């Protein structure tokens, strides 16, 4: 019967596992456990990508069930397509770049 | 692929000269071994 | 610096580029001795003096050749440089235990050399069956060594073989399943699974070995109601899985240079080549005892090994049919690389045909411990496993330095590589049908022809092998560094330039569910 | 302009195959090497016994 | 940090085509040397 | 899969897009020459116009060149191509790689 | 034995070493029908400058590539199979013959009426008289009657060799605690060689087998005289 | 499966610890006192030197080379017999 | 046009029948003059003399298809060297002959042949097909 | 006994640019030593050991 | 002038596949087939024919005169 | 019976390449008989098939190995 | 920098002075067995358990005071251990193997039976029963231990463990105990060979299983799990469970089976 004593990780986790833990609290994934959602991937909703620097790799998978990928780097600037399907790409400085 | 100039080019004299030392650094000490094998054999 | 870096290392770039000069080195150690055979028969009567002496220096090619040359550059060495940057990784789960895997290989090939200098040496095949490696036929200390030294190397291919397994599955972007890999990360994983399985049982057996010879246990000493066939199927349950752990990086990495050099964006049938290396990797844990066809062993199990043995055509087929079809239509680019890759292809074939000949326990009476079979493993490995490793070191070795080969030497190299490896083995099967025993220092004057001709051979694969290295100090004495790479689209590899900075992925890929 | 292939191509090709003819010629048939071919043909018995 | 780019990411140094000559030939003779004296010490030992 | 006529019709009408960006226009050679065929010459006729809208003499060049590479050892069929295409090659001023030296090395 | 420059098996001396022989030329068939197809395709791939780069469909091919090597492996298990029982197959057998493996040489037992053994030892090149075959005479052959079926029984007393004589198509290790058999039959007198297939240390190379296959009445003659 | 009980309800330490306490520990009081009454030692056996017993092929790396290393005098002969 | 180490992950110019418009034009400064004769090309390419024409397509690609696709006499030096150096191996094989290999066995001998060889014919050595197959025990020859 | 894992979170995440092995302080350092005298030492002693074996001695 | 008439553009390289496996598959068979029967049959026939006439008897006779045993002067 | 004895015959009990148990049981057999027999009188003469095989199969290493450790009562088959 | 959840280990010395350790111990090993001296092997143990403490040490640093172990690196460790506990239990395999292989085929040079001629078996109703009850008990109280561990319950936590970590030592004293009395040793041919052998290496893991508990339950008097976050804990109870699973089948394969 009852007694406690054992810490809980909101008591006790530090570092990036506390950091992990809290921004999946407010539904944020700033280390990039989850794969993001596809948009339309047009010119006007393009997939926005975000990342800490200037460029961040894309990796392109066509369509469901291909099993090549297609890589390239995404720059800051106007959205840039996918070579092989030409969906539309554009890297959101910020929501990471802090 | 597509490269840059040798920064430090390797004239064809110098690898005359990086072959043959290549060559050599296996063929002496083997050749010396095997040259005197059968002073080995039996001392 | 110096010693942060390179010997208290957690990067797998430099990781593996340790195992890179490791098996760079063991494999001029395996050549020397590979010349030593070839020059004790290279005419009729003794050179060396000492059949003691020749049977430790037969034992010694195998074991470096095999664990020391192919199992660190293959699996080590490519493994750990590419791995990681094919699905995007910053590391491998576990950069420290990877640091570990390397660091036991050193000691382990030091206690290797130790063996062959203490005593008289372990003169006992590659397969150390007692009773001739027990303590009487082979007292002292010569064959503690080598098991020791096998242990040490089992415990780096065991704990290389989780690190590469956890890393596979659990390091790639969530976006990403399994048949979204390259094939060579799938040849990898399969390759870490029959480690795995295999090596713990040949630790297991060795082990045995080790208290038979100091303990007074009896499990291979019929004195003791032990029995020296137990030994042979432990020894070839781990023996059949690892030569599969030894060709199949080789046709990982076969498939990414015929798909580069070929300008095609996927191999043909990547699924089927997926099948194919899993269909592989299981049906061999259950054909070993092909290994043991004269031992005694009754008609029906016999019956058994031999139609499982057959089997593995079907799937490995598929294979050589599908890097034909990935050929076919390509604007091909006539690289050295793809030089090496061709070469492969038809001469692991023709390796793998006189394996299926080898697989009827019917004609293996005749066959069994001739040179017929010496001819088989030589032309899978030395015209397979070496050649996919040569492909492979060519392809990637700019990405590795930075710094490009000369193209017209690489091409020369295989030339001559090609002559002195074919000049060399093809002989051994009319040694072998003509009924010349494997193990032999010397024998009766009818086999002299072949085998002066098969030791000639061995001499222009020496030059060769002197070529290569004059090969790679020109690249590095005339740094051409390299600007542009092809087909990066399709070879996430080459993305991060060249070579690829220290840390590659911080900031992993961005990869898209829809 | 003509590469190095052109300038060289023909005597590099000339010179490799004369010299890998004849020093291999030499080899096989001059300095003793036991070949052991077939007797068939060749040889004639002589009694033994 | 670390160095990075060509010649940076090898435990040797690349910077004189002849040190690195001698030193290819020290790394690569001695493994090459290395049986043949192998089998020079097992014959005389006896 | 389609039809021969169904293909054709689908690439000329990729072509002819009158707002065709510079991209389209190499993301569909660069698609076109990945099959086993020489294309139409209707459909090489809408390739050339959307280069001469995208003002790129060059990449017209360019297209003729590859043509004559996909037909590979049948001679005949870039002489062909280039009769078929005779009257817009004169209508937009285009030269052939022949008629600019390019042919030669 | 092997003459020089020969290029397959020794001439078979018994009906199963010939039935290895057909069947060696069945499979031998067959390997040089794929080798040469495969080497006929890869050159056909690298023989134009036409191209096709887009993705290929893979799911009508695979099944040829299935199905063809399926075919012929079965091809060539069903006789292969086939003679593996033969090899085991019920014999009655006349005579019994032990062998056992030494390092390095071998002894013979013919222990059916009377007890009958005796050494077998290399003849050191020194020691051959002219027309003798270097690493292949010994002092003592095995004496046996042709046109018999035989069993030798074969064990080691030390460590494991192998008996083997490949123009018999013979070759059962010599294990010691183990009793192997295989059956022996010689359509034909003579000579037939071979040597230890097991590497069993230092001489390995130098422990060969002689089998002198003659009439009955001459082997009961001389297994007298062995006594 | 299935034993003869049930527990699903009231949860987690709580059932696994009257497991422990109710039927584990238990069992093992049991197994002990069933083995202190089945104690009490057996004769040694009788010395016959079989030769796949005993083995010395090498001696062993203590000791006077001839003892395992669990020697027990009572019970554990030598090659050549009982010490003593 | 010159290419830098550090623009790997910028689009790349690469010449490829497989790719026949690349990426970026080979290229990218317009001098003076130049930027004169991109005008000129928005106008009817009727009026470009020949000379324009070329090097318009000099400044989008670097080699023609013709220049790209052209063969070379790198297989002479290739097969040449290759030989080379076989030929150079002869010469370690005449130097492993001389100092390292001693005799042949007494029984390489012509007369040890020649009583050998009888002797396998007496033993009828592979009579079927291999050697004794080839003796005609008649006439006592050979074969022909 | 008290929790005092706080106290060593901020021990060890303090930026002090020592690797975790050493972040402890001088005991660490020592053991350090202490481990890397005796693995070195131990080598060159195998290595001794292994050259004497490799002669025989009667 | 004179027009060009149009020729075959579409499946160049299948066209050529479906003419060139079939000699794949002639050449890879007649390389079988000459194996079949210039060395397998003949090997039966070398065989049958050996043994058609053989006597072993004869054959020892001749051994034994030419003086190879140790058990048969 | 058989004073027509070549060799041992085909045995269904050991069907295979291994003999092993076949020299191994008839060593038992024979010596269990001859026991059997001697003990009560009786003529060692119906055991005679037993020894024949054995001595037709056993190598002869075996057999005076076995013979010496019955002597000494170290035999660790059941007699 | 990163923004990925993967750790980047420091740059360790460890790999290296571990590798060095088992170089030390296999020539000490050598050196014991054949020149007859133990300072070599000495040397390498001591070497061995430094490395094995400073190595795990700084993993209990880098997650329980550093917090690296994000759950896509708990996830890894996960994998990790089990693909570890697999390859061991090959390893057992090939002893079940030479068992199996000597018993179903007992030789003549036995008596050609199973147990040998001259070899008197344990009473598997007797210690090897005892033996049995206390490592399944130990499953039991360690399964409490974890539940406690997850409602947060100290006290009660600790006395599981402490329960299943005397159970593992209680097991090692019969063992140990068994091991003297037996009436056939190590040298009896290959029944004493495959017992000695194959319940040796399983006493050697349950050494290794206890001292593992042991850090384990160290570990929680001082704090460092918290209700949802034990990998050490879940690791060494696998490594528990596992240790018993192959006892289970030593029992019935060589005490029951074989006896
Ligand atoms: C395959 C690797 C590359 C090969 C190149 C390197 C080596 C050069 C050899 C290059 C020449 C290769 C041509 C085939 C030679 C087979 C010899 C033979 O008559 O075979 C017979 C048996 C023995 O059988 C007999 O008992 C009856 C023979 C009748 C005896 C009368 C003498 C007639 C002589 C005719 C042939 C002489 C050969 C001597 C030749 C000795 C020189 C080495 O031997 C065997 O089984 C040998 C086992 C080999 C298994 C691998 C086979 C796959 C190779 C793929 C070939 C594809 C097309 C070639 C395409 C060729 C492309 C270059
Ligand atoms: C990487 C090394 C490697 C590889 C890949 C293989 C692959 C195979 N090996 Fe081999 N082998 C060894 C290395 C290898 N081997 C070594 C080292 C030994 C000796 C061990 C020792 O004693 O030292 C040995 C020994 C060995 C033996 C023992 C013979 C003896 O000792 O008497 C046997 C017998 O079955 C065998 C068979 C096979 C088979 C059937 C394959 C197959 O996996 C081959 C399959 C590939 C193909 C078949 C060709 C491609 C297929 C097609 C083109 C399709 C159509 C084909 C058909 C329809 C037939 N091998
Ligand atoms: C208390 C129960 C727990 C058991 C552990 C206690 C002892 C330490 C040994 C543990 C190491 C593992 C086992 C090695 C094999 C032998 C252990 C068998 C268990 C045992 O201790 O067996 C004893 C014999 O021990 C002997 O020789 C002792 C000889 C010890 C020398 C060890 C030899 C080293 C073996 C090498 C290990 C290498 C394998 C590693 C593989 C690496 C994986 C790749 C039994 O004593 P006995 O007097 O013969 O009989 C009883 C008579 N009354
Ligand atoms: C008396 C002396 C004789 C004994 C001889 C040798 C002794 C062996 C020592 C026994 C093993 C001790 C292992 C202790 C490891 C401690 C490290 C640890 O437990 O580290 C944990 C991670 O697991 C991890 O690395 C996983 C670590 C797993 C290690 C697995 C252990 C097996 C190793 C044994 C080798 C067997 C070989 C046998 C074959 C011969 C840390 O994460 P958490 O627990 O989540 O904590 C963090 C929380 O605070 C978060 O809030
Ligand atoms: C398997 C790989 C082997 C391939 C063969 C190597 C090819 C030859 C390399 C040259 O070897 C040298 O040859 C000399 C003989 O030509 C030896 O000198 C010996 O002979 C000389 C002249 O007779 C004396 O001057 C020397 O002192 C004496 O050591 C010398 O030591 C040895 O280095
Ligand atoms: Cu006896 Cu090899
Ligand atoms: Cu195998
Ligand atoms: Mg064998
Ligand atoms: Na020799
Ligand atoms: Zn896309």
Redesign the interface.
């Known amino acids: 019967a009852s007694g406690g004593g054992v810490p809980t990780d909101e008591e006790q986790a530090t570092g990036l596992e506390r950091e992990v833990m809290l921004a999946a609290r407010k539904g944020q994934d700033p280390y990039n456990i989850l794969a993001p959602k596809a948009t339309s991937g047009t010119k006007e909703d393009p997939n926005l990508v975000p990342s800490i620097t200037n460029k961040r790799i894309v990796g392109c998978i066509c369509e469901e069930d291909n099993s090549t990928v297609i890589w390239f780097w995404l720059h800051k600037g106007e959205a840039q397509r996918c070579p092989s399907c030409g969906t539309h790409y554009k890297l959101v400085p910020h929501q990471l770049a802090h | 692929i597509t490269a840059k100039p040798a920064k430090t080019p390797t004239s064809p004299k110098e690898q005359a000269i990086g072959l043959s030392v290549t060559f050599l650094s296996f063929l002496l000490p083997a050749g010396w071994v095997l040259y005197h094998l059968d002073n080995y054999k039996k001392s | 610096m110096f010693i942060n870096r390179w010997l208290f290392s957690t990067n797998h770039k430099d990781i593996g580029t340790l195992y890179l000069l490791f098996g760079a080195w063991a494999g001029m150690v395996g050549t020397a001795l590979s010349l030593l055979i070839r020059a004790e028969l290279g ?2 009567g003794t050179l060396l003096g000492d059949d003691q002496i020749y049977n430790v220096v037969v034992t010694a090619h195998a074991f470096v050749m095999i664990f020391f040359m192919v199992m660190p550059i293959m699996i080590g060495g490519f493994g750990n440089w590419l791995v990681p940057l094919m699905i995007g990784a910053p590391d491998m789960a576990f950069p420290r235990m990877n640091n570990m895997s390397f660091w036991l290989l050193p000691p382990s090939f030091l206690l290797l050399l130790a063996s062959s200098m203490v005593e008289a040496g372990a003169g006992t095949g590659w397969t150390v069956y007692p009773p001739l490696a027990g303590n009487l036929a082979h007292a002292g200390a010569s064959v503690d060594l080598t098991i020791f030294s096998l242990h040490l190397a089992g415990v780096s291919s065991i704990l290389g073989a989780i690190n590469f397994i956890t890393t596979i599955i659990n390091m790639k972007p969530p976006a990403m399943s399994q048949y979204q890999t390259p094939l060579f990360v799938w040849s990898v994983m399969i390759t870490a699974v029959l480690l795995l399985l295999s090596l713990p049982v040949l630790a297991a057996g060795i082990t045995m070995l080790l208290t038979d010879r100091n303990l007074n246990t009896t499990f291979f000493d019929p004195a003791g109601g032990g029995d020296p066939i137990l030994y042979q199927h432990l020894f070839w349950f781990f023996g059949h899985p690892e030569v599969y752990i030894l060709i199949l990086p080789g046709f990982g990495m076969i498939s990414h240079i015929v798909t580069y050099y070929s300008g095609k964006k996927e191999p043909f049938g990547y699924m089927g080549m997926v099948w194919a290396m899993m269909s592989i990797g299981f049906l061999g844990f259950i054909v070993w005892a092909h290994h043991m066809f004269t031992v005694g062993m009754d008609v029906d199990t016999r019956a058994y090994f031999t139609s499982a043995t057959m089997i593995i055509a079907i799937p490995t087929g598929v294979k050589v049919f599908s890097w034909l079809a990935t050929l076919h239509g390509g604007n091909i680019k006539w690289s050295p690389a793809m030089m090496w890759a061709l070469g492969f292809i038809f001469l692991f074939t023709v390796g793998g045909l006189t394996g299926i000949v080898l697989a009827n326990s019917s004609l293996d009476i005749v066959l069994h411990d001739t040179y017929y079979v010496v001819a088989h493993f030589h032309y899978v490995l030395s015209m397979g496993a070496v050649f996919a490793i040569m492909g492979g070191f060519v392809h990637w070795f700019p990405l590795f330095s930075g710094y490009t080969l000369n193209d ?1 030497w690489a091409k020369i190299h295989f030339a001559i590589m090609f002559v002195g490896v074919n000049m060399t083995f093809f002989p051994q099967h009319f040694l072998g049908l003509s009924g010349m025993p494997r193990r032999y220092s010397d024998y009766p ?2 086999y ?2 072949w085998n ?1 001709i098969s030791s000639m051979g061995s001499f222009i694969s020496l030059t060769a092998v002197m070529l290569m290295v004059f090969i790679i100090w020109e690249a590095f004495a005339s740094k051409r560094e390299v600007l542009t790479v092809d087909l990066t689209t399709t070879n996430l590899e080459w993305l991060n330039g060249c070579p690829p900075p220290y840390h590659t992925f911080e900031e992993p890929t961005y990869v898209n569910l829809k | 302009a003509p ?4 300038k ?3 005597a ?6 004369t ?6 010629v ?2 096989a048939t001059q ?11 060749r ?7 | 940090h670390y160095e990075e780019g060509p010649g940076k990411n090898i435990p040797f140094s690349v910077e004189n085509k002849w040190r690195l000559l001698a030193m290819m030939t020290l790394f690569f003779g001695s493994g090459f040397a290395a049986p043949f004296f192998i089998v020079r010490h097992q014959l005389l030992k006896k | 899969h389609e039809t021969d006529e169904e293909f054709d019709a689908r690439w000329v009408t990729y072509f002819n897009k009158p707002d065709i960006d510079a991209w389209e226009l190499r993301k569909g050679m660069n698609t076109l020459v990945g099959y086993d065929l020489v294309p139409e010459p209707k459909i090489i006729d809408a390739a050339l116009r959307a280069c001469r809208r995208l003002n790129d003499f060059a990449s017209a060049v360019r297209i003729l060149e590859v043509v004559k590479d996909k037909a590979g050892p049948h001679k005949e069929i870039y002489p062909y191509v280039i009769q078929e295409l005779r009257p817009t090659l004169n209508e937009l001023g285009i030269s052939t790689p022949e008629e600019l030296g390019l042919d030669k090395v | 034995m092997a ?3 020969q290029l397959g098996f020794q001439d078979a001396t018994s009906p199963i070493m010939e039935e290895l022989l057909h069947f060696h030329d069945h499979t031998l068939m067959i390997v040089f029908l794929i080798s040469s197809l495969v080497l006929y395709i890869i050159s056909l791939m690298l023989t134009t400058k036409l191209t096709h780069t887009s993705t290929m469909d893979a799911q009508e091919v695979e099944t040829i590539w299935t199905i063809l090597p399926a075919i012929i492996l079965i091809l060539i298990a069903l006789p292969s199979l086939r003679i593996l029982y033969m090899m085991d197959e019920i014999n009655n057998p006349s005579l019994t013959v032990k062998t056992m493996g030494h390092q390095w040489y071998w002894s013979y037992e013919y222990t059916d009426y009377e007890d009958l053994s005796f050494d077998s030892y290399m003849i050191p090149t020194s020691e051959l008289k ?2 003798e075959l270097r690493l292949l005479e010994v002092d003592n052959r095995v004496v046996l009657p042709m046109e018999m079926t035989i069993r030798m029984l074969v064990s080691s007393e030390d460590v494991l060799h192998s008996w083997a004589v490949p123009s018999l198509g013979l070759k059962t290790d010599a294990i010691p605690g183990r009793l192997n058999q295989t059956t022996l039959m010689s359509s034909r007198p003579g000579l037939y060689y071979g040597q230890c297939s097991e590497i069993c240390g230092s001489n390995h190379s130098f422990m060969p087998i002689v089998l002198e296959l003659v009439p009955l009445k001459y082997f009961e003659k001389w297994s007298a005289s062995m006594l | 499966a299935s034993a003869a009980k049930g527990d699903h309800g009231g949860t987690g330490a709580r059932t696994w610890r009257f497991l422990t306490f109710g039927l584990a520990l238990p069992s093992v009081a049991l197994c002990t006192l069933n083995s202190w009454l089945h104690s009490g030692h057996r004769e040694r056996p009788a010395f016959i030197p079989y030769h796949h017993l005993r083995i010395r092929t090498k001696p062993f790396s203590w000791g006077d080379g001839n003892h395992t290393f669990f020697h027990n005098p009572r019970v554990n002969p030598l090659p050549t017999g009982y010490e003593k | 046009s010159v290419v830098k180490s550090e623009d790997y992950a910028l689009p790349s110019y690469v010449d490829r029948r497989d790719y026949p418009l690349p990426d970026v034009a080979h290229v990218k400064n317009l001098s003076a003059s130049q930027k004169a004769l991109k005008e000129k090309e928005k106008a009817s390419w009727s009026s470009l003399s020949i000379d324009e024409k070329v090097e318009l397509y000099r400044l989008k690609f670097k080699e023609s298809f013709a220049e790209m696709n052209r063969s ?6 290739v ?6 150096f ?3 191996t ?2 370690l ?2 130097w492993e ?2 100092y390292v290999y001693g005799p ?1 066995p007494h029984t ?1 001998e012509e ?1 040890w ?7 396998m ?2 033993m009828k050595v592979a009579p079927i097909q291999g ?1 004794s197959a ?1 003796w005609d025990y008649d006439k006592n020859e ?1 074969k022909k | 006994f008290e929790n005092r894992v706080a106290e060593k979170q901020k021990l060890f995440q303090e930026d002090n640019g020592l690797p975790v092995h050493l972040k402890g302080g001088a005991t660490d350092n020592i053991l350090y030593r202490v481990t890397m005298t005796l693995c070195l030492g131990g080598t060159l002693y195998s290595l001794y050991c292994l050259g004497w074996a490799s002669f025989p001695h009667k | 002038s004179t027009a060009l008439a149009k020729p075959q553009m579409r499946g160049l390289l299948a066209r050529r596949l479906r003419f060139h496996i079939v000699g794949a598959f002639m050449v890879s068979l007649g390389f079988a087939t000459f194996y079949k029967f210039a060395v397998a049959e003949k090997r039966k026939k070398a065989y049958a024919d050996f043994y058609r006439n053989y006597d072993s008897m004869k054959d020892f006779e001749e051994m034994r005169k ?2 190879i045993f140790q058990s048969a002067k | 019976k058989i004073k027509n004895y070549q060799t041992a015959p085909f045995d269904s009990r050991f069907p295979n390449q291994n003999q092993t148990r076949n020299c191994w049981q008839n060593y038992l057999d024979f010596h269990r008989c001859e026991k059997a027999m001697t003990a009560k009188g009786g003529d060692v003469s119906v055991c005679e098939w037993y020894r024949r095989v054995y001595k037709s199969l056993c190598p002869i290493s075996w057999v005076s190995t076995w013979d010496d450790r019955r002597a000494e009562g170290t035999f660790p088959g059941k007699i | 920098h990163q923004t990925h959840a993967y750790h980047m280990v420091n740059p360790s010395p460890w790999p290296l002075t571990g590798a060095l350790s088992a170089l030390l111990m296999t020539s000490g090993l050598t050196m014991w067995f054949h020149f007859n001296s133990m300072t070599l092997l000495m040397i390498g143990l001591t070497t061995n358990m430094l490395t094995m403490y400073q190595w795990w040490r700084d993993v209990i640093r880098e997650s329980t005071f550093q917090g690296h172990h994000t759950p896509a690196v708990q996830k890894g460790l996960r994998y990790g251990m089990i693909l570890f506990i697999i390859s061991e239990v090959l390893f057992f395999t090939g002893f079940f193997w030479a068992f199996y292989h000597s018993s179903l085929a007992p030789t003549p040079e036995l008596g050609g039976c199973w147990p040998p001629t001259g070899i008197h078996p344990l009473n598997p109703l007797e210690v090897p029963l005892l033996n049995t009850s206390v490592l399944l008990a130990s499953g039991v109280s360690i399964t409490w231990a974890h539940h406690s561990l997850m409602e947060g319950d100290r006290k009660h936590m600790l006395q599981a463990l402490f329960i299943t970590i005397t159970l593992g030592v209680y097991f090692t004293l019969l063992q140990a105990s068994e091991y003297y009395e037996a009436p056939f040793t190590i040298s009896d041919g290959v029944y004493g060979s495959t017992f000695f052998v194959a319940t040796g290496f399983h006493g050697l893991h349950v050494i290794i299983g206890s001292t593992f508990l042991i850090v384990c339950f160290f570990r929680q008097l001082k704090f460092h799990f918290t209700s949802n976050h034990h990998f050490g804990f879940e690791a060494a109870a696998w490594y528990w469970h596992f240790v018993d699973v192959v006892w289970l089948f030593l029992y019935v394969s060589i005490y029951w089976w074989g006896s």
């Open positions: 005419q009729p017209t004057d009818a002299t022809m002066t | 590469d190095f292939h052109d060289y191509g023909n590099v090709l000339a010179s490799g195959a010299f890998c003819v004849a020093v291999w030499y080899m300095i003793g090497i036991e070949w052991n071919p077939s007797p068939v043909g040889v004639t018995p002589k009694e033994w016994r | 003459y020089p420059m002219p027309g | 070379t006499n790198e297989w002479k030096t097969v040449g060297a290759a030989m080379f076989i030929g150079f002869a010469l094989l005449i002959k001389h042949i390489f007369e042949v020649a009583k050998q060889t009888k002797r014919l007496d050697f080839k050979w | 030419a003086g």
